[PDB]
Design a protein around this ligand. Sequence first.
Ligand SMILES: *Cc1c(COP(=O)(O)O)cnc(C)c1O
Length: 230
Amino acid sequence: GITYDEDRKTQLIAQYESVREVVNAEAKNVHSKILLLVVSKLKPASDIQILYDHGVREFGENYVQELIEKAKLLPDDIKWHFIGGLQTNKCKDLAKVPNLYSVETIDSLKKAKKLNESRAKFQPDCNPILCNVQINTSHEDQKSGLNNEAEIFEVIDFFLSEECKYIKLNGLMTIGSWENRDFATLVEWKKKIDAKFGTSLKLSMGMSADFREAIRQGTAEVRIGTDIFG
Ligand SMILES: *Cc1c(COP(=O)(O)O)cnc(C)c1O
């Protein structure tokens, strides 16, 4: 497939395994496996091939066109996770990727309906896209994420409806803020929702600077790039 240098291979795998060892060590230190989503945004496809060949399957991309271009160049069994800003007009585009495993940035009912809509038309055959609801856990104003309980509840209601058959509600997601109060707020959102809808939501929180704490607060998935591709 994509050709890569041997010195970079040895270095990428080393840095990755070291990140994965700390994630596993942190997890094993609590009261069962956490996903290490490898955020390859802006990284070349050769780097992904390096890790792919190493056994890695789940990579996170933030840009729609980049993910699509990347998906066509690399193996079909990669489990792409779209973790960037989602515009309703790009849903149709994303839905076309067969191996689009997950979309963690659904932050409106309009978007959920459009992705489910698009997925039905272009890849009804393919497995339902696993989805996370992005919530603004910061107590500040943030360009993305939901903060309104009524609107959040309305998004969850649709996911559990019979009409939503091509995208599956998996959990909650947050970019945090800039002990962790943000992860704490996400944890509280999962309880209020699990209680009201009878769900057992999966949490996606924790990045390069705070994945350890996220791991301590119950995360089911951490998204790390910098620590792995440096
Ligand atoms: C880029 C990004 C990450 C990862 O942070 P790193 O310092 O690169 O580990 C995780 N989640 C989202 C939504 C991102 O934009």
